[model samples]
Target: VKDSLEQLRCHFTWELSIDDDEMPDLENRVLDQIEFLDTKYSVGIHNLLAYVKHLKGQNEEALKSLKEAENLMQENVRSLVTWGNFAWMYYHMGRLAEAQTYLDKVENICKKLSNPFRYRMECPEIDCEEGWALLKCGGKNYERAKACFEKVLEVDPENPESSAGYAISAYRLDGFKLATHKPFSLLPLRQAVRLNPDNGYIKVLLALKLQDEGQEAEGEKYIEEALANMSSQTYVFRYAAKFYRRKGSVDKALELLKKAL
Candidate 1:
């Protein structure tokens, strides 16, 4: 059975073309493949990437790849969840309004399809990415941004991006209440660090959270950790610079900031 499945998968991979626009024909092929690949594979990753590439005007390449992926991933829905990243991608591309619009379309699709299996895998994620888009939108929705991040954590307890996103939203929500989450604030920062153990920005968040709570010693400890995690002069060094300035050691802070510059 395993060998048969593999052979079928191989055959399916070559037979599905990404560029085929005969929606019904392509869709039917995908449905048949889905019936076969459910237990064997989830080709949604390739499909999502391919479609996104297409959405970004990568054209023939995206269409072909996405079609193949769609054919392979009829049953596995996890890849569809990550498709929320589309809003983030659009946000980064400076299409804030379009980002919101695109995410809303995805949300509507999820709702209209209303498949528990698909929604279970994909629904929670829409909030997180849409939250990101709201932030990027840079309008009056910062409160909504904070709400969305909170909603994301409610949906996914361990998502580092949501944690970081909440922190950012918190910072924007209130000026001095950066420590609104208190001990819980540290939790998200820690979660983010655990996810990206070597990331300077994660370290910076850790440091910021610590210092905000008056954990000067531990904050400095993570500041060093952040600096050490990255190359010689990555951006988080700015946190270290702040630490020095607070200590009346302006020279050290200036040196670190200059290096970042």
Candidate 2:
């Protein structure tokens, strides 16, 4: 059922979300499995762990996990997956140039092997990765990212990663009020949150939509929950800064923004 690149990424994100409450156990289980099997699947598991570490704001360990995965691959073809994973991690870390370079490497490898239709066939994970990198790259590529997500969703409508990606792209292209009313934008965000409630950034986005729709009480609830749950200033402070500014706490908003920067 889940075969595409976007689907793979979504599945990993979902796995981590569902197991978040039992992260210690989950981490141990993966580690145990890695020690036991010493297979490519174990390497993939390490990549998942790397993603979990990234979500936990431990980028150092995240990179370490990817490095270990790369070592385990040892020039294997599947190392391409590790490279794509590394690209996503680098993008999230704001290393856009490095992210692009890695992505290009993957693409070049695929082309060199005459896999012209590889990504189109079952490589939506790379598509999702590229979509996300482009989405975050700035305004120049938002529409292209949206198109990528749209193509992914054509095959997997409920794919949370692609759906959320589309939503974010739409939100960037259209203003909040307009974007929230668009089915592709708002509904996907809602689905994303339903699929992964623990994601504070998604919660924040939903809260923004709610507030735009005059559901301030519910919106504030989400906002407060996000603030309480999010550990990363990179995510929290930007929204919090805006929240404070909206509440007329300009000085506090400025302080938060400065800290976030």
Error of 1 at 222 (Å): 0.7
lDDT of 2 by residue, 13-76 (tens): 3222223455545555444322112255456666767866776678889989988977876643
Distance (Å) between predicted and true CA of 221, model 2? 1.3
- lDDT of model 1, residue 7: 21
- How does model 2 score by TM-score? 0.54
**C-alpha lDDT of candidate 1 relative to the true structure:** 0.52
Candidate 1's residue-wise lDDT over 140-248, tens digit each?
Answer: 6577777878887887777766776676667556554432454465666677678656556656666766776878788777777767745534545666788777757
RMSD of 2: 13.4
Error of 1 at 72 (Å): 20
Q: Give lDDT: candidate 2, residue 222.
A: 78
Candidate 2 lDDT score at position 69: 79
